[PDB]
Amino acid sequence: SRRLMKELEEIRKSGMKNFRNIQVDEANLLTWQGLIVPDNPPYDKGAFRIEINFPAEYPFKPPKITFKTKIYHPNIDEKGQVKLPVISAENWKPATKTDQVIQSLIALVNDPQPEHPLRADLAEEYSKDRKKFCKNAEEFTKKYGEKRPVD
Amino acid sequence: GSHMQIFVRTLTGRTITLEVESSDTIDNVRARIQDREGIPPDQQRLIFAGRQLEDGRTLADYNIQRESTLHLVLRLRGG
Amino acid sequence: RYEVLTAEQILQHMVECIREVNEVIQNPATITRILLSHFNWDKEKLMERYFDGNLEKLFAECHVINPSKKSRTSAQDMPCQICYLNYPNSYFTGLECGHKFCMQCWSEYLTTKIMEEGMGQTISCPAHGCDILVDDNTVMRLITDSKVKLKYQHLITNSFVECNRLLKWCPAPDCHHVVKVQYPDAKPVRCKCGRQFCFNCGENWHDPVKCKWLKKWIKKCDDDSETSNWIAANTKECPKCHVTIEKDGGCNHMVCRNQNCKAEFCWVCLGPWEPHGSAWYNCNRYNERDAQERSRAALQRYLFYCNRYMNHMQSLRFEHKLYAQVKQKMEEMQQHNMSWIEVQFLKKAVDVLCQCRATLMYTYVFAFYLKKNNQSIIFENNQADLENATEVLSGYLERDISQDSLQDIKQKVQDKYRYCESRRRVLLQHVHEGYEKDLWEY
Ligand SMILES: [Zn+2]
Ligand SMILES: [Zn+2]
Ligand SMILES: [Zn+2]
Ligand SMILES: [Zn+2]
Ligand SMILES: [Zn+2]
Ligand SMILES: [Zn+2]
């Protein structure tokens, strides 16, 4: 609760190019909300809302990210879960700043990887029929994805 | 082709010398290491000047001049 | 035939092996810990690979990197980078990489890696990209809780034990000690804490049954459908007055809590007690088409043998309570007369009571996998002769011991517990001799 005061302070100052509208529940700094804007298709047509849930033992135990906005991705569960090794159990380092994790989630969004997916069906489609994928995720961003911020 | 000479520090600390070109893809480098030291390009992580050298770009994108040093680190476990 | 060592004693005998292996290799002592634990502590095999080539693959495969050796190249508030607090440099200590962190955060990190999802041997500096190991010294120096220090001292030495044929841990939960024998003989050992476990398999001492069979039993119960039914021995009802009765002690010889229905019966079979031991009464024996009826008949057969094993389970745990009441039946009795020869004869009796119960549990395991042979019915008799002898010895040390005088407890119990072990004697002598001729399997 002392480090989170300085981390969230660093985001509001230097600013995050891929992360906007960082609004959190006050007093209780265990749950965060934010809106992600990818830079590359088929997702660069909308914006998706994530929710961070820092556990009590932060930063000696890593947070958990869940997608509130539905998304078409092989490494993202339908509920919103995400397999990310940089916040996994046997990999988590307490020095890892939060903004460091977000930019590591952006890479998974921009360039997915199907070798270890959460939805194998979409993982097959991304590797075999790319054009069918970039069209489904295109239509899936338009329907469920929220609008991109102005500037 | 005597266009670029770079150094890479291995896991055991030994620093081997590679020869490449300024317009060489970064993926090409991760392959030469495999033929040289036997580490697959999946189990590799290249660090220069602090930030990670992901595969997909080229040597020219990073300010990597001749006679530069490059570090080889392990990649994250079981994702 | 028995030697018990401490956790650190093993670690000393292991770090000495790490030292001699290392001086030809010249690798940080933390690294060589991994490499040998990778080669299953075959010292010669790591030598060969190192005397050959292809080391970067070995380092990559074992996920371990050497640090830049520090040899080449004080009271100020520098900010910490894990908690963002201001402490003097006296508080910060870091590994070979130069990542200095406050000893406070170090203690939480090191402990949360040992105590949570176990990190065996492979803790690294907690600085993002840093993957350099944490030496044993800087763990023992930064941790105060000895229970953590003892667990870490078990993790980093675990590989050295299992890979050694003459070493085995003790199944005790928080006891981190090792038994060393001259050769694996599937014999029981003392743990320095009263744990008598089979050195071969690693479970409790299974005198009648073989090691491989008991493993199949536990695995069968844990896997499917049996982890839910084993909680059924809590309460039953009187087979005559139909009042709900809850079993308290280890003895099965129930007697209804009713002045109008003083019926004495059996907890397992719900039959009257007096006939137990007669010629024409068996509550330990089974002795009982389509393919669907073939499976349901074999399932109820398991429930017959599993219910016996699970009942003697809780009944053994209920008979460990006697040890607390034996010391209340060893003081004033030593106060009255003849101290500390008549009181140790009373503990040797309850020691046999719990021993005949432990072997009784495994009696049904060995019996479940038996083919109905000419030696099966002979064995069943030695089982019923022991199961009854135990219920008498356990029944006396739960009700009939207080209502007696001291001039009688001496001869009462001594005749009981020595007869009770005489039935375990003939039972074990039978199956051991029957083992030598291969007279019963499956
Ligand atoms: Zn700190
Ligand atoms: Zn470090
Ligand atoms: Zn022990
Ligand atoms: Zn065994
Ligand atoms: Zn009754
Ligand atoms: Zn009975």
Numbering used by the authors:
A (entry chain E): 4 to 154
B (entry chain F): -2 to 76
C (entry chain B): 100 to 172, 180 to 394, 401 to 554
The authors write:
RBR E3s are a distinct class of Ub E3 ligases that harbor three tandem zinc-binding domains termed RING1, in-between RING (IBR) and RING2 (collectively called an RBR domain). However, rather than facilitating Ub discharge from E2 ~ Ub onto target protein lysine residues directly like a canonical RING E3, E2 ~ Ub binding to the RING1 domain of RBR E2s is followed by thioester transfer of Ub to a catalytic cysteine residue in the RING2 domain similar to HECT E3s14–21. HHARI (or ARIH1) is a member of the Ariadne family of RBR E3 ligases, which also includes TRIAD1 (ARIH2), ANKIB1 (KIAA1386), and Cullin-9 (PARC). In addition to the RBR domain, HHARI harbors an unstructured N-terminal domain rich in glycine and acidic residues, a UBA-like domain, and a helical C-terminal Ariadne domain that is characteristic of Ariadne subfamily members.
Here, we report the crystal structure of HHARI in complex with a UbcH7 ~ Ub thioester mimetic. In order to gain insights into the molecular basis by which the RBR Ub E3 ligase HHARI recruits the E2 ~ Ub thioester intermediate, we used an E2 ~ Ub thioester intermediate mimetic that is stabilized by isopeptide bond formation between a lysine residue that substitutes for the E2 catalytic cysteine, and the C-terminal glycine of Ub (denoted as E2-Ub throughout). Almost all contacts between UbcH7 and HHARI involve the RING1 domain and the Ub molecule projects away from the surface of UbcH7, adopting an ‘open’ conformation that results in contacts to the UBA-like domain of HHARI. The UbcH7 and HHARI catalytic cysteines residues are separated by ~ 54 Å, thus, the structure suggests that the UbcH7 ~ Ub intermediate can be recruited to HHARI in its autoinhibited conformation and that UbcH7-Ub binding does not induce large-scale conformational changes required for thioester transfer of Ub from UbcH7 to HHARI. While the Loop2E3 region adopts the same conformation in all HHARIAPO structures, comparison of HHARIAPO and HHARIE2−Ub structures reveals a striking conformational change in the Loop2E3 region that is centered around His234 and Gly235. This Loop2E3 conformational change unmasks an E2-interacting surface that is buried in HHARIAPO structures and results in positioning of the loop closer to the surface of UbcH7 in the HHARI/UbcH7-Ub structure to facilitate additional intermolecular contacts. Most prominently, Lys96 of UbcH7 projects towards an acidic surface on HHARI that is unmasked as a result of Loop2E3 flipping upward towards the surface of the E2 compared to its conformation in HHARIAPO structures. The model reveals that the Loop2E3 insertion of the HHARI RING1 domain (His234-Gly235) sterically clashes with Ub in the closed conformation, in particular residues Leu8 and Leu71 (bottom).
